[PDB]
Short mmCIF file of C-alpha atoms and ligand atoms in Angstrom, two decimals:
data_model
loop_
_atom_site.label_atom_id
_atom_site.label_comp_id
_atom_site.label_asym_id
_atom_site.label_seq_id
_atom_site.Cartn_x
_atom_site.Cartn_y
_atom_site.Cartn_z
CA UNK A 10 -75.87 36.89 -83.06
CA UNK A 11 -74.30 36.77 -79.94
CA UNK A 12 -75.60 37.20 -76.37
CA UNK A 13 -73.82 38.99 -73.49
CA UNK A 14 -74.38 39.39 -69.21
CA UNK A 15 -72.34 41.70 -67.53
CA UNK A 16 -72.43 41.83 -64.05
CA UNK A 17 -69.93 42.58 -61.21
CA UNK A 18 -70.35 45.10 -58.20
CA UNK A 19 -72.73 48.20 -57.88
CA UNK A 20 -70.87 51.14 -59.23
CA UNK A 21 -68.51 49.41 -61.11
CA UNK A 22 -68.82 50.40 -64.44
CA UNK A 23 -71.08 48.47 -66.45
CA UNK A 24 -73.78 50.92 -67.21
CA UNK A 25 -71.06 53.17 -68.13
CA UNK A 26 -69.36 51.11 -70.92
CA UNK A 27 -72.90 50.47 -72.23
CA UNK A 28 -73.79 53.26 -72.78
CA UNK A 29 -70.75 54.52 -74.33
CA UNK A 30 -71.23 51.25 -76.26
CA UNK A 31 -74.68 51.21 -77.36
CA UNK A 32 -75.88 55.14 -77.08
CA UNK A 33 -72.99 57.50 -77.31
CA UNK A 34 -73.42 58.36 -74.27
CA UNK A 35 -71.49 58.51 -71.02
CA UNK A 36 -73.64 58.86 -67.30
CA UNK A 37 -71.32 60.46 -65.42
CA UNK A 38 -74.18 60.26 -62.41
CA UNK A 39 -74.98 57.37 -61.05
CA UNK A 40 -78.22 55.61 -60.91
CA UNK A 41 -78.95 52.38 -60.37
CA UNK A 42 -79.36 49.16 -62.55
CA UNK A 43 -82.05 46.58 -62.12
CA UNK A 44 -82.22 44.87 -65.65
CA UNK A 45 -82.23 46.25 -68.92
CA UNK A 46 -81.14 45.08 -72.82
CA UNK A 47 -79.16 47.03 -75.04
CA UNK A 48 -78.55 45.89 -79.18
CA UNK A 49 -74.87 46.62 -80.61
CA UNK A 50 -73.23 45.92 -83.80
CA UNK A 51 -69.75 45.24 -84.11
CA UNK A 52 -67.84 44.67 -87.71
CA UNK A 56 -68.61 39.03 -90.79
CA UNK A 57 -71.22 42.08 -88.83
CA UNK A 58 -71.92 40.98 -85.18
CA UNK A 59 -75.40 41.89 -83.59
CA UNK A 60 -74.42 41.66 -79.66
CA UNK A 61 -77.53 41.22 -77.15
CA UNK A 62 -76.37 42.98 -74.22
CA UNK A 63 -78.06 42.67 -70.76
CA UNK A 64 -77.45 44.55 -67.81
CA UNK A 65 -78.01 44.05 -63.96
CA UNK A 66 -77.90 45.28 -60.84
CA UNK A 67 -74.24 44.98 -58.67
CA UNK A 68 -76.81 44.52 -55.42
CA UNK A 69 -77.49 41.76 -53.55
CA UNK A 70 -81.21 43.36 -53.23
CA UNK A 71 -81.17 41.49 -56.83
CA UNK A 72 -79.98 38.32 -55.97
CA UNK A 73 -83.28 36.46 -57.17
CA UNK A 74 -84.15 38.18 -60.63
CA UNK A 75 -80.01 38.98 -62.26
CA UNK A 76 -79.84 34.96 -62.55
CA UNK A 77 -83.08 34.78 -65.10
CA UNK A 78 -80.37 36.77 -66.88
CA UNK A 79 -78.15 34.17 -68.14
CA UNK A 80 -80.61 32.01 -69.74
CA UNK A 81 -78.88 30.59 -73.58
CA UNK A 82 -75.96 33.24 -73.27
CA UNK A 83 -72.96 33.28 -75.17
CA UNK A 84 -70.73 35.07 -72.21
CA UNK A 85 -70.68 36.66 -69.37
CA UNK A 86 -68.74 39.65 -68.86
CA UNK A 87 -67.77 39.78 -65.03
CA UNK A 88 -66.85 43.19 -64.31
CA UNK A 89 -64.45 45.16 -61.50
CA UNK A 90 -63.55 48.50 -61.04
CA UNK A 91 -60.15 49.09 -60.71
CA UNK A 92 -59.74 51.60 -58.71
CA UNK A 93 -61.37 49.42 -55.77
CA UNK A 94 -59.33 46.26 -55.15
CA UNK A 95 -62.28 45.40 -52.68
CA UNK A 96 -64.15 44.95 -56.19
CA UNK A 97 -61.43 42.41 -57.04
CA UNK A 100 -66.28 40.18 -54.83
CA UNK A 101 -65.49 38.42 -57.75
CA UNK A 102 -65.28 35.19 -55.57
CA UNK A 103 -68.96 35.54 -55.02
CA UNK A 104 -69.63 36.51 -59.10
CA UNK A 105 -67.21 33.64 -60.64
CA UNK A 106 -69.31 31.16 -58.17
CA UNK A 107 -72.34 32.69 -59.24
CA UNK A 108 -71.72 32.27 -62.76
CA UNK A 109 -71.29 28.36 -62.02
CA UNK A 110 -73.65 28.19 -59.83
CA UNK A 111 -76.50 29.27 -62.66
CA UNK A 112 -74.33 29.53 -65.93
CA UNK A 113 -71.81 26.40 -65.99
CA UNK A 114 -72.11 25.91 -70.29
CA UNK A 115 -70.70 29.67 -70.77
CA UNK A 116 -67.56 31.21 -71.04
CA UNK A 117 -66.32 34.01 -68.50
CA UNK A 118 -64.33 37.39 -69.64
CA UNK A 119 -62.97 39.74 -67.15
CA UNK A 120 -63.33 43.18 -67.32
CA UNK A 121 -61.46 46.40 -65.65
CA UNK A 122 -63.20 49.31 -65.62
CA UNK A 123 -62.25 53.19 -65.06
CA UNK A 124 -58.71 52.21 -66.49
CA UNK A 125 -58.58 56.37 -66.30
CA UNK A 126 -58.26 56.17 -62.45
CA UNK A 127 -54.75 55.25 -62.33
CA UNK A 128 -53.60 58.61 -63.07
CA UNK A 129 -56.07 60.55 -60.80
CA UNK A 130 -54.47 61.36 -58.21
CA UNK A 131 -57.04 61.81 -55.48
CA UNK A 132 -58.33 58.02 -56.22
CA UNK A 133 -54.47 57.46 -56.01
CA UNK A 134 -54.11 59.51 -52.66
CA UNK A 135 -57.01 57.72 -51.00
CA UNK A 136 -56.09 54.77 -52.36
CA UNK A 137 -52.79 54.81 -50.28
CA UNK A 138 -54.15 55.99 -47.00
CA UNK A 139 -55.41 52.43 -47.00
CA UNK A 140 -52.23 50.88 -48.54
CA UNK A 141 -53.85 49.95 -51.73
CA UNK A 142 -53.03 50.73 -55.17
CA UNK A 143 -55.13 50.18 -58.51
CA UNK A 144 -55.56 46.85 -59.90
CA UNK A 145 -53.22 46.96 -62.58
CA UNK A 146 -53.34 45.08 -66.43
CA UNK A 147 -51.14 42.36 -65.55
CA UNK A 148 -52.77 41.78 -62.16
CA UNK A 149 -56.11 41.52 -64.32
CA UNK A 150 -54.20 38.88 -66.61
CA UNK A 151 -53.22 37.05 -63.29
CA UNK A 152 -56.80 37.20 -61.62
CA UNK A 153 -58.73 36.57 -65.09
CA UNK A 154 -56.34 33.14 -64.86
CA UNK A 155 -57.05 32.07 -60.91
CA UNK A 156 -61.01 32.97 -61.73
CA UNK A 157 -60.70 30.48 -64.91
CA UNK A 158 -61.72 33.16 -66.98
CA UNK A 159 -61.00 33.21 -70.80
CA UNK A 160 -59.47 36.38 -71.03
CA UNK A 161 -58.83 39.75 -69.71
CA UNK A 162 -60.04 42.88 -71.16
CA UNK A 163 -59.86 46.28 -70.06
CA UNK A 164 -61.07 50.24 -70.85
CA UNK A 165 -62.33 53.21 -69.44
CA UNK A 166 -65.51 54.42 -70.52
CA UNK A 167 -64.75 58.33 -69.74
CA UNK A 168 -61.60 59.02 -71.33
CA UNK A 169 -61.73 55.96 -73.64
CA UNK A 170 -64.85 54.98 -76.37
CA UNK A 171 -62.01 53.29 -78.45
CA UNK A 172 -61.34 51.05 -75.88
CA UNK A 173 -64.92 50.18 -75.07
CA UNK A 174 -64.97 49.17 -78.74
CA UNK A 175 -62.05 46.77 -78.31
CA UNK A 176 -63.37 45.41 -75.23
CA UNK A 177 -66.67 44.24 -77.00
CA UNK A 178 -64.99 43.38 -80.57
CA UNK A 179 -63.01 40.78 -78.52
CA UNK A 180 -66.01 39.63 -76.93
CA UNK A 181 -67.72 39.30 -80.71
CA UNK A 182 -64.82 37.54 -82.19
CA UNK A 183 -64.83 34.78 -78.42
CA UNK A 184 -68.19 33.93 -78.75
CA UNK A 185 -68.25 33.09 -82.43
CA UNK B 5 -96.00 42.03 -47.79
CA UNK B 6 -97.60 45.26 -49.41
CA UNK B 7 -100.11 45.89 -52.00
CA UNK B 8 -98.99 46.96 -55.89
CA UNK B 9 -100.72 48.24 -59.23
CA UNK B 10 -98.92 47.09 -61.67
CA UNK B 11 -99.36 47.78 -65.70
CA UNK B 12 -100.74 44.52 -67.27
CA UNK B 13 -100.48 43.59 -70.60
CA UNK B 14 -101.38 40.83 -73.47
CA UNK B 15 -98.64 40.33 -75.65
CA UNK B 16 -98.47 38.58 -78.71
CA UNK B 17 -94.60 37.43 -77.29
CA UNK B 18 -91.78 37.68 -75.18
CA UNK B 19 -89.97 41.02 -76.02
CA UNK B 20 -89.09 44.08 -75.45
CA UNK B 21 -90.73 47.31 -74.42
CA UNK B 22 -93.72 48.35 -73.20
CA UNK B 23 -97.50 49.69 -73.80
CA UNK B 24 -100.51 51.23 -72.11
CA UNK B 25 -102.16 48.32 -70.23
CA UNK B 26 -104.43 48.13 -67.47
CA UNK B 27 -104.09 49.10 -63.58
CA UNK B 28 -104.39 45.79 -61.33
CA UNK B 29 -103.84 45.73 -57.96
CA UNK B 30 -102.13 42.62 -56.47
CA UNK B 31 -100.18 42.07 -53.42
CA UNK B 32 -96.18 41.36 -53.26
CA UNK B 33 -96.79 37.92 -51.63
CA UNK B 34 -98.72 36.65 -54.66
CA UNK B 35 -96.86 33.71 -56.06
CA UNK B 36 -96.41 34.37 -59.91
CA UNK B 37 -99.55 32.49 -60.48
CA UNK B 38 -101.79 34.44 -58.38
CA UNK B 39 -100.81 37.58 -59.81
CA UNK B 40 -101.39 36.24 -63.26
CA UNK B 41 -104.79 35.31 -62.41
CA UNK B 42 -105.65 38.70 -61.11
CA UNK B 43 -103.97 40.03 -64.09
CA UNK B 44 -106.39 37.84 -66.38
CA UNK B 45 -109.46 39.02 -63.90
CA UNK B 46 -108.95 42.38 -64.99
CA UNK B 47 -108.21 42.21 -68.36
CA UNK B 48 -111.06 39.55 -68.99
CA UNK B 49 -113.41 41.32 -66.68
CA UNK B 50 -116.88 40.89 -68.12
CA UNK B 51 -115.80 37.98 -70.70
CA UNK B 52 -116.87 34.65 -69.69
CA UNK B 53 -115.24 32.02 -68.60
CA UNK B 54 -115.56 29.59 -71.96
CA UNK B 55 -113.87 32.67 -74.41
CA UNK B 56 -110.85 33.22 -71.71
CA UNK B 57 -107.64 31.83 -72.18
CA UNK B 58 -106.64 28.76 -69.75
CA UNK B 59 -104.31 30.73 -67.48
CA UNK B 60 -101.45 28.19 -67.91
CA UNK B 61 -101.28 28.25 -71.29
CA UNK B 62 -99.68 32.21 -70.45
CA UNK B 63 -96.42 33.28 -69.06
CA UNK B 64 -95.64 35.99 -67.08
CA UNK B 65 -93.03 38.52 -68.06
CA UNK B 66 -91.41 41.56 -65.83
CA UNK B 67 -90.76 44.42 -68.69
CA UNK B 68 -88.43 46.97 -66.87
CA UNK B 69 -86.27 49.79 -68.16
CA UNK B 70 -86.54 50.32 -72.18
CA UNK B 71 -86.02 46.90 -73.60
CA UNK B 72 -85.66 44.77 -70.52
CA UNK B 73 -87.88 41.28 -70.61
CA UNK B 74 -88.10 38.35 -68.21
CA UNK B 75 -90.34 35.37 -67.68
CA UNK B 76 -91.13 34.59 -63.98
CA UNK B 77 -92.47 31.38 -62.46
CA UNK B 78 -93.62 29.95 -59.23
CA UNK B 79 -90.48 27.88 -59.27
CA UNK B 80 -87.26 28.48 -61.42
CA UNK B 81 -83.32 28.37 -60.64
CA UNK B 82 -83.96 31.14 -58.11
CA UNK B 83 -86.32 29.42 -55.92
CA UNK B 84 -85.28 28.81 -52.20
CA UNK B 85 -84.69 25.63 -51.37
CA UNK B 86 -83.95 24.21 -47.58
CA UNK B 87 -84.13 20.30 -47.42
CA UNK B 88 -86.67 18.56 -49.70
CA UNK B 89 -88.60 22.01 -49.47
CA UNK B 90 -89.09 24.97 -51.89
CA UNK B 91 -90.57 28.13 -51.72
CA UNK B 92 -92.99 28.93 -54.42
CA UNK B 93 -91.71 33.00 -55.78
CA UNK B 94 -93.82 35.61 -55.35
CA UNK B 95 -93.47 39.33 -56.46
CA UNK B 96 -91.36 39.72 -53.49
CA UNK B 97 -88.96 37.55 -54.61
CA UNK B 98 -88.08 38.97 -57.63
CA UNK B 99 -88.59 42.69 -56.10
CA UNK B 100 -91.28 44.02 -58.71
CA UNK B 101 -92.08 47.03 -57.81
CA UNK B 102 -95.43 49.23 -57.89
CA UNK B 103 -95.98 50.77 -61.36
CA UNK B 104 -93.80 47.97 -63.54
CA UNK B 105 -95.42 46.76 -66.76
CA UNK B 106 -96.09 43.07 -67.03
CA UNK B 107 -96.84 41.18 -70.04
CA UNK B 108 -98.78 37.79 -70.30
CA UNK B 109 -97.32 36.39 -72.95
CA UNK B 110 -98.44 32.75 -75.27
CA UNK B 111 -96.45 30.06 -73.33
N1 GNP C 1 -63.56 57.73 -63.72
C1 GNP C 1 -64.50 56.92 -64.26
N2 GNP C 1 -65.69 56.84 -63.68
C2 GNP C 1 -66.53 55.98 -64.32
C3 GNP C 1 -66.28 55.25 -65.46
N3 GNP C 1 -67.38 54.49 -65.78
C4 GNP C 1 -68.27 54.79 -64.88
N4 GNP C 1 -67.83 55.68 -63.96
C5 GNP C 1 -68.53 56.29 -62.86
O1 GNP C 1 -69.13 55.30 -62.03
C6 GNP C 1 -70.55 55.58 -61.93
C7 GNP C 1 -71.24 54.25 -61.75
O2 GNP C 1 -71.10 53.48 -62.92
P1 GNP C 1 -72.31 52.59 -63.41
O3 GNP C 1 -71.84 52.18 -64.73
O4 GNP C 1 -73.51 53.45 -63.39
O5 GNP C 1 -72.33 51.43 -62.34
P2 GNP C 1 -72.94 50.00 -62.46
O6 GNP C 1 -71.83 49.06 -62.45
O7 GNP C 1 -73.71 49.95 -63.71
N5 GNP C 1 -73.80 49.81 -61.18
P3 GNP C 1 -75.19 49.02 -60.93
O8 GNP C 1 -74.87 47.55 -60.93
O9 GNP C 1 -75.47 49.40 -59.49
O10 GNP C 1 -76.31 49.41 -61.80
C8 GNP C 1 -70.88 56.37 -63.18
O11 GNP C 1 -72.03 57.14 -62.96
C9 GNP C 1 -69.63 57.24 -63.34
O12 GNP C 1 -69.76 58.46 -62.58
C10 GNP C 1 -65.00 55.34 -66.06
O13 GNP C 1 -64.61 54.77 -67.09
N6 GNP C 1 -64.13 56.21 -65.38
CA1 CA C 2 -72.65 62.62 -69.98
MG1 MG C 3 -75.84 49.68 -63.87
#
């Protein structure tokens, strides 16, 4: 029995993965997170707790409550927004409330690398997408365990992975 | 601050989900306390005052979403602090909104 936050910046991904995780399911529209609990099992059998929260500081006060006797937290980015890449204010969040648990970071819409209009916009601002190695590198200068990565739209398999690593950390 | 009904509930625990409860009307600057107490006014209305439950012997729990459950207090990890001074949380805090189920739970 393991318990899991994820949390990271409003329309990141976590919802999305989730989903795919939990209810075979993928919400391709968005709509907003405040707090909610999913239950997965990964194969010894794992039964992950799995909260979710809100990316917005409008949540500030009630996403801490949150990490109460948790196993991990799963601090996500989205990929194709190195502005996500915030996680200054989540890693000193997580220490601020959450200093006994381990950190994993987590890349989401892995997809967007090869679509071209998020690559196209993208480079109007001289930006590319945060690539796997750069997630090795800032998973290291965040002191988080590990880096893990997937993309819930083109990619189940890898949501799998993603959370079967997480299993297999935290016990 | 504004006024909210919220859905109030006994529960036998801290948990998941929700139920039909009963309509109380509180205000968003109630500390977690005062809400509670109107909670228990409305779902003891009628009952006297010897067969209620002593009010701090109960929690109070936001249930939001499907399965989401969390235990607020007047003062937690969340509470603002500025000197030797903190604020006591109300509903406004923690952004409750109008409608949400909330449990009182066996502390
Ligand atoms: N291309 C792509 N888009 C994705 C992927 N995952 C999610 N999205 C898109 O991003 C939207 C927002 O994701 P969501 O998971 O809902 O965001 P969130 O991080 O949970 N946000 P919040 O904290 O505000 O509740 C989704 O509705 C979907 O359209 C992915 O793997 N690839
Ligand atoms: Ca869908
Ligand atoms: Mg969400």
């Amino acid at each position: 029995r393991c318990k899991l936050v994820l949390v990271g910046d409003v329309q990141c991904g976590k919802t999305a993965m989730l989903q795919v995780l939990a209810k075979d399911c993928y919400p391709e529209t968005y709509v907003p997170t405040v707090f909610e609990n999913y239950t997965a099992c990964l194969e010894q059998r794992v039964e992950l707790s799995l909260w979710d929260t809100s990316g917005s500081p409008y949540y500030d006060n009630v996403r801490p409550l949150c990490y109460s006797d948790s196993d991990a937290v799963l601090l996500c980015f989205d990929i194709s927004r190195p502005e996500t890449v915030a996680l200054k204010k989540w890693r000193t969040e997580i220490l601020d409330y959450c200093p006994s648990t381990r950190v994993l970071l987590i890349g989401c819409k892995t997809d967007l690398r090869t679509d071209l209009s998020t690559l196209m916009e993208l480079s109007h601002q001289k930006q590319a997408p945060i690539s796997y190695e750069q997630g090795c590198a800032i998973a290291k200068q965040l002191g988080a365990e590990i880096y893990l990565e997937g993309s819930a739209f083109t990619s189940e398999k890898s949501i799998h992975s993603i959370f079967r690593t997480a299993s297999m950390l935290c016990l | 601050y504004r006024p909210l009904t919220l859905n109030a509930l006994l529960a036998v625990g801290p948990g998941a989900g929700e139920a039909q409860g009963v309509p109380v009307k509180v205000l968003d600057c109630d500390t977690i306390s005062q809400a509670k107490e109107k909670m228990l006014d409305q779902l003891y209305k009628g009952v006297p005052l010897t067969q209620r439950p002593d009010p701090r012997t109960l929690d109070v729990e936001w249930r939001s979403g499907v399965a989401g459950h969390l235990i607020l207090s007047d003062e937690d990890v969340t509470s603002e602090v500025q000197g030797l001074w903190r604020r006591l949380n109300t509903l406004q805090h923690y952004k409750v909104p109008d409608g949400a189920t909330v449990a009182l739970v066996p502390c």
